[PDB]
């Protein structure tokens, strides 16, 4: 996360770290319901060879070759609270496109379900669509400016950008922003997600419910923290039906 601030311990109990067996983090995610983690589809497959730019099952990451850590706060150090959990299956959106990053969402079924508590509880699915200019919170353990990694989970608070002016901003640039994507960040730039934040949660507060809702997952952004350019997230309300069909989660 660029231009972020350290997340206060315990206030992001739905966040998941996707890590190699080794422990090296590579992506983030979110707990849905009892035993599912929603993340970016591009977190769960090898880099593709441009001379053969089509995703196959042979490129997918095996359940035995990564793990999930919930209730985590430090990037590399450890809690109490941490629950290290194996993977059962993985399912990337049926219409995921690895070249254009559309439908860049995936669901990781856990081999073992976490013990729900003050530090590990799920994020709610979104009830409706997002209003222009809503303040959301993007969280993650990825790189920051001058390319260090933080000791702690970092977070930014940024406004949602209207879909149209997001498309017009990314042309230049021959890059399409489709209906299944939502945009955040400000024109000046600065506050943005980056390498290692992929799949991390974008959430907002509902009132007067006091409930927190997942609006998007981190998908892509050209360069981290650079003006006239917005961060692009997978719009979860758009694929809510598919998530509900695979998961069977309900608020």
């Amino acid at each position: 996360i660029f231009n972020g601030r350290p997340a206060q311990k315990g206030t992001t109990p739905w966040i998941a770290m996707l890590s190699h067996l080794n422990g090296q983090p590579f992506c983030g995610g979110s707990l849905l319901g009892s035993s599912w983690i929603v993340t970016a589809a591009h977190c769960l497959h090898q880099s593709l060879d441009p001379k053969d730019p089509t995703l196959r099952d042979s490129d997918l990451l095996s359940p035995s070759d990564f793990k999930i850590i919930l209730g985590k706060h430090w990037r590399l150090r450890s809690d109490e609270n941490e629950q290290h959990l194996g993977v059962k299956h993985t399912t990337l959106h049926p219409q995921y496109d690895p070249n254009t990053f559309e439908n860049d969402v995936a669901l990781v079924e856990l081999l073992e379900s976490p013990v729900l508590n003050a530090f590990v509880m799920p994020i709610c699915l979104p009830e409706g669509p997002q209003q222009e200019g809503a303040m959301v919170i993007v969280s993650g353990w990825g790189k920051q400016f001058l390319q260090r990694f933080p000791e702690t989970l970092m977070e930014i608070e940024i406004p949602i950008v209207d879909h149209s002016t997001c498309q017009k901003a990314y042309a230049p640039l021959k890059k399409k922003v489709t209906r299944d994507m939502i945009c955040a960040g400000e024109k000046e730039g600065g506050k943005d997600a980056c390498a290692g934040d992929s799949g991390g949660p974008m959430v907002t507060l509902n009132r007067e419910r006091g409930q927190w809702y997942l609006v998007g997952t981190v998908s892509w952004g050209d360069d981290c923290g650079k003006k006239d350019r917005y961060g692009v997230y997978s719009y979860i309300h758009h694929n809510k039906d598919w998530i509900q069909r695979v998961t069977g989660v309900r608020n």
Binding site: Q8, G10, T11, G33, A118, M121, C124, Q211, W212
Partner: protein, 147 residues
């Protein structure tokens, strides 16, 4: 030939056929009310048969009726069972109410969570029948505040 003595029905039960007097070779079946079964030794049964013997005595005494036991109700994961007042009785017509562990779980209405012990010895709910309720995870309610 020889007359066998008047028989008294068991509490919560009955004797058929009801005759004024009983004579040699007469058969009678002892039965219990709905929710009860006949108890011989430690064995429950629907009917027990006694006969009027040649010497004017019955083949057996009249056994007792025992209330049906539904035993341990099914365990609801992430849930809790509250029994209806003190004894924690699990026998005919008594009730339990299922709940989910607050705050991290809530129950699906569907149902009331009230399961009542049937005459057939199964714990039953108006809506779900034998099937148990479902505790679902409560989402997006953090316990630590943000400044």
């Amino acid at each position: 030939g020889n007359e066998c003595p008047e028989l008294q029905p068991p509490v919560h039960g009955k004797i058929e056929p009801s005759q004024a007097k009983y004579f040699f070779k007469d058969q009678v079946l002892v039965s219990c009310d709905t929710g009860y079964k006949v108890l011989k030794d430690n064995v429950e049964m629907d009917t027990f048969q006694i006969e009027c013997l040649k010497d004017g005595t019955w083949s057996n005494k009249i056994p007792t009726c025992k209330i049906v036991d539904c035993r341990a109700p099914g365990e609801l994961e992430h849930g809790l069972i509250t029994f209806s007042t003190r004894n924690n009785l699990t026998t005919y017509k008594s009730e339990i109410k299922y709940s989910c562990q607050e705050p991290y779980y809530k129950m699906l209405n569907n149902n009331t969570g009230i399961y009542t012990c049937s005459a057939q010895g199964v714990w039953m709910n108006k809506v779900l029948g034998r099937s148990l309720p479902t505790c679902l995870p409560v989402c997006g309610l953090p316990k630590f505040s943000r400044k």
